[PDB]
Amino acid sequence: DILLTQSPAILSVSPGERVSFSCRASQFVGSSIHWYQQRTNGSPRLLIKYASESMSGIPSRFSGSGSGTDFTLSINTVESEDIADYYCQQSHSWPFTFGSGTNLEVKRTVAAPSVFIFPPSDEQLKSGTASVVCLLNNFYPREAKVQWKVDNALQSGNSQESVTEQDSKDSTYSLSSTLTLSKADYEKHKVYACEVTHQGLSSPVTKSFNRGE
């Protein structure tokens, strides 16, 4: 079977720059290389067939070239909506095979998160569990640090984080940190605080609430 190698797997470029994705075949595939785009939670979409024919409805900044074993997908001036995984596929020989994908990150200016904290709902509290949620919204770059303090005592082992994929509208990320306690432990303390550090914040940002106010 023919292996398609897409390397690098990760590309990061500034907006308005030209980017090229590499696809190399372990065997001759002629010009029978097709390119797809897959946005987050979306379906693959055919961009270029047979190495270099863009499909109708595909913006002109997309192009492709190559023949034999070495193929390129280029975007001539990248915008944020181009953030996606990019896949090559060969139909020279059966079975048809896909590359492993290259992810496109589009850089942007530093953006500090907006920070929000959510007490556990009364509805959840009646079940014996308290989830406290801290949201870091629309920030860049991706690296951020979130610490929970409960009556100024730093929490450990009782929280989980989730991060979105980069946003194709504004090139940001968002993060949630969920602190889970029993209703018993929750009711034993007063001050619940989320403390956030990020390249875009000149000092750590704390959001907090007093249980029952």
Partner: protein, 220 residues
Amino acid sequence: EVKLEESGGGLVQPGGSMKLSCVASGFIFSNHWMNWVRQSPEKGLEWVAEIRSKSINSATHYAESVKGRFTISRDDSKSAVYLQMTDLRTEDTGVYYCSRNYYGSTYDYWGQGTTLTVSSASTKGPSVFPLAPSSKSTSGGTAALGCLVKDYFPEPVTVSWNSGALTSGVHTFPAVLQSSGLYSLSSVVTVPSSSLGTQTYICNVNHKPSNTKVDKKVEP
């Protein structure tokens, strides 16, 4: 407009069976070659099976990894293609796309995918709690609110806002596997703080494998 719409995904025990369906419109179904292509974090995009036209004996082809376990079939009178899976394995877990391949070249149209989970754990529907805005979720003229979708299995759940009328500013986080073995996620949205208490905000949670369809009004 070409549309492919899959259905039938869900949870099945290792060694179990499950049949996926896909219904196509917008092209002459009986003239074309229908495919199933699956996707997983580990194996990427993987062609699974193809059934070609009735004119050439409706010939079926399978990836080596599913040969003998999967059967692809079609019903031209319904514009439907089916994938009968048997002797399922943990590594068959993934998203299964219905796709048209143009006579052995491009996969030129794709469905939205349906999700298969091969696991011995049980289906469990989610609990939905509001993430209520106050001043501690008011950053200037922007407020945040959301829904917490807790303790469910398997993936996926969909969350929409105001029945899909509210899409700007929505962030539905990837699920996290909890130590309990159950998933949990939150969906949030940022709105003008002036619209709190004057505009209604409802999250529409759907978790198909448990027939959960819950609408939660999120209030201050």
